[PDB]
Enzyme design. Structure first.
Site, PDB file in Angstrom:
ATOM      1  N   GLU A 226       0.899  -1.151   0.000  1.00 30.41           N
ATOM      2  CA  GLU A 226       0.000   0.000   0.000  1.00 30.41           C
ATOM      3  C   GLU A 226       0.942   1.206   0.000  1.00 30.41           C
ATOM      4  O   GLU A 226       1.532   1.542   1.034  1.00 30.41           O
ATOM      5  CB  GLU A 226      -0.854  -0.020   1.277  1.00 30.41           C
ATOM      6  N   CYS A 260      -2.123   9.160   1.815  1.00 29.51           N
ATOM      7  CA  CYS A 260      -2.002   8.553   0.513  1.00 29.51           C
ATOM      8  C   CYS A 260      -3.251   8.748  -0.331  1.00 29.51           C
ATOM      9  O   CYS A 260      -3.169   8.799  -1.562  1.00 29.51           O
ATOM     10  CB  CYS A 260      -1.628   7.084   0.666  1.00 29.51           C
TER      11      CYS A 260
END
Lengths: 452, 452
Positions: A226, A260
């Site tokens: 991720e 993110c």
């Protein structure tokens, strides 16, 4: 490995890194703990996970204070982070056993099914930006599945890393089932190469992720990555502009820009761009910059001096190339790693910033003439984590859902992770999915069973 | 890159490897093809896959002859292989759309779901041992999901590689949807590092899989690895010993022993070991060795001179250490790469061979006292692909299912792959699952969609 308070620049506590021998001894203990832990019932794991949820729920403010002290996110958003950590523990406590129940398929066999068994020791490499949530997002399903874990956290959140291990101990998970490793980035290689470590997860940024997955692949070990994003926030003429501006400001500036799934690139249809950007500018300029412990603060400092230097250079180079600063764009002259909410517009084609992740409250703004151009621009990036698009036309909404190259597409809302739904990236944002059913299915052996 | 007939040792056809430019052109064509192909309906893909199935079912004998010619498996088992290749085409034709249908989750969104979209170009690196089946096992689900694929096949089965591409073209899959690359191992790096290639699968052995997965991880790309095994074949006192001997002989000797899920290590309870070993000895001794095109042949040549050299050395070294040859153990004195059915007993503890995969009809045989010891021996390998256990005691069955460290456990049957059930290894045998639902879910973006 140290606590350095980004609000002050002050070194608060220094920690000694484990030696190779001490890492080795922690892995030995994890292996032995795994042998016992895989034989625990789901009911025992559920109780321990619920205990951990209750500890998080009772002491959110104390935990949030640690997060804020180490990495600078507002105390209030850190309380929310601890609450969301409790939520994912309860989610897997509630669903883990059913998510891992045998799945039967009719064949000629008297019995044929897939069953789901833990792999062993999992390495998790976690970043500083959501120092509780990212850890619990991995840990809740990993432990519910019967794995044990070693955590290498970011070196600037050692107190957070130790608090997570302490919570799980106090909850009742046996010694060796979850251990924090106070080690540097260079020591992760030892762990990955150990025969007892069976799989690894990394949340963070590309060079650490490329290193881990490279080493893991060489050892024939599965991974989940991720990594970052440059998520589009597309605003089209049928959008509720006021909600879009408000939610877009939240999506850009939350966690001091250091998410993110931040809204990074604002892609505005010609018809509404003037009004939107005018309102965005006003919203950004009204944000309160200061002490993250103060409940009225919107924007705390960036997490580190390096993070501050990164964005300062990135923005300076773009402006030098002829990007226009509509707002902000220069660091603050005060103590602590403070960078202001910034709006860049009229970025020249081919500017380097177009392909970079801006991990600070810096919005890049673009105007587009139609849906084709919006999709093209939105996807014109190495990353593919989230995407947000604003429109009340059904056909537009469907084109957005289908054509945006991202692991998540939100229509008329900001991208958010949620335990009930899988979460992960595509392209250079990574691969694999946390949360939902996928999250607990990642680090299990799906053993096919056939009995005559 | 050549056809060298293992039955005679003669070079039949030599092939020119693609240059780097020619590889780049294939990939440009794949990217272009992917843009159209992702827009095809499931109904279109289902027709093309059913056409491929019809082509395989029509000409099993011709395709089987190509397989036998290049790599030496019996014409009859290659016919079976081509029928199994059609079976998996049909399976995903029939199931692919339902397996990829939106999955809804109730949240506060008006609409929230996961949808499944193709990644783009998939690289597949495949081995010589099941030169049709392993390609179709990958290709049918990848294509049904809307991916395109480039195949790098083993250097010694180029005619099989070219035939697979030809089948899919005649079936009606558009140019660029499935392309065979006649390239050497040293050229796979170029493909993995190309920004258009989004994921990779490898079936084969550890060195190649380690290389590919390491390179893919470096590039932030997901992989699936199906590598070797040294699968146990465990026989206990309540077993139907005669069925066990018959089935274990097949499990060890099918494909001239060259299967990752062969029975390689026979683990016999002392109570039944003398009877089982005598009957296994008698079985192996009367197997027909000869020309693989003859329908009466049990055992054809090993695929390659190096495969012959490998087993020869492994066995000689084990015998030098003190292992006993019950049967065989020497290459045959005739043309082509023939190794005979072999049984090794009384292998010294710590012998090297205990840890290696024997890709040849070479059974290693052990005696044990109890279930505990069976399980510890069964798992005492780097590998973890399949495992077979023979018992009519329900408690023993459960112990084997739970405690054998394998991706598959068959009770009272030999390990077999089936389109209906997921299939893959654990430990050093790899990660990820082909077949069943898991197979089509591997190379898709599971995209979370949330609509206010």
């Amino acid at each position: 490995i140290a606590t350095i308070n980004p609000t002050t620049g002050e070194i608060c506590q220094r920690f000694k890194a484990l030696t190779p021998a001490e890492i080795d001894a922690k892995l030995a203990k994890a292996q032995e703990a795994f042998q016992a832990y895989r034989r625990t019932s789901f009911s025992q794991r559920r109780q321990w996970l619920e205990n951990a949820a209750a500890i998080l729920e009772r002491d959110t403010s104390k935990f949030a204070e640690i997060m804020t002290t180490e990495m600078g996110k507002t105390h209030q958003s850190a309380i929310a982070e601890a609450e969301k950590s409790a939520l994912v523990c309860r989610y897997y406590a509630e669903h883990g056993e059913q998510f891992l129940a045998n799945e039967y398929t009719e064949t000629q066999a008297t019995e044929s099914y897939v069953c789901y068994q833990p792999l062993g020791i999992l390495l998790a490499v976690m970043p500083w930006n959501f120092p509780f949530w990212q850890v619990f997002r991995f840990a809740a399903p990993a432990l519910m599945a019967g794995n044990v874990a070693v955590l290498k956290h970011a070196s600037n959140v050692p107190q957070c890393a130790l608090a997570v291990e302490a919570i799980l101990e106090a909850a009742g998970f046996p010694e060796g089932v979850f251990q924090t490793l106070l080690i540097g980035a260079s020591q992760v290689e030892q762990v990955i190469k150990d025969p007892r470590v069976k799989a690894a997860t990394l949340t963070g940024s590309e060079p650490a992720g490329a290193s881990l997955a490279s080493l893991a692949g060489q050892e024939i070990k599965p991974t989940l990555l991720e990594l970052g994003g440059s998520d589009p926030f597309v605003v089209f003429p049928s959008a509720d502009l006021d909600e879009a501006v408000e939610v877009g400001t939240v999506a850009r500036t939350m966690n001091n820009g250091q998410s993110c799934i931040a809204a990074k690139r604002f892609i505005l249809h010609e018809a509404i761009a003037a009004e939107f950007l005018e309102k965005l500018h006003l919203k950004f300029a009204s944000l309160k910059i200061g002490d993250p412990m103060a409940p009225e603060t919107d924007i705390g400092p960036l997490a580190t001096e390096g993070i501050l230097q990164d964005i300062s250079r990135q923005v300076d180079q773009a402006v030098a190339a002829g990007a226009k600063i509509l707002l902000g764009g220069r660091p603050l002259d005060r103590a602590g790693y403070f960078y202001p909410p910034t709006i860049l517009t009229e970025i020249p084609p081919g500017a380097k910033i177009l392909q970079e992740e801006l991990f600070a409250p810096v919005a890049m703004v673009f105007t587009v003439k139609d849906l084709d151009q919006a999709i093209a621009l939105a996807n014109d990036i190495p990353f593919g984590l989230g995407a947000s698009a604003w429109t009340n036309d059904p056909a537009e909404q469907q084109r957005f859902i289908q054509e945006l190259d991202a692991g998540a597409v939100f229509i008329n809302g900001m991208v958010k992770s949620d335990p009930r739904l899988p979460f992960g990236g595509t392209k250079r944002s990574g691969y694999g999915r946390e949360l939902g059913l996928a999250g607990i299915r990642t680090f299990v052996n799906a053993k096919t069973v056939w009995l005559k």
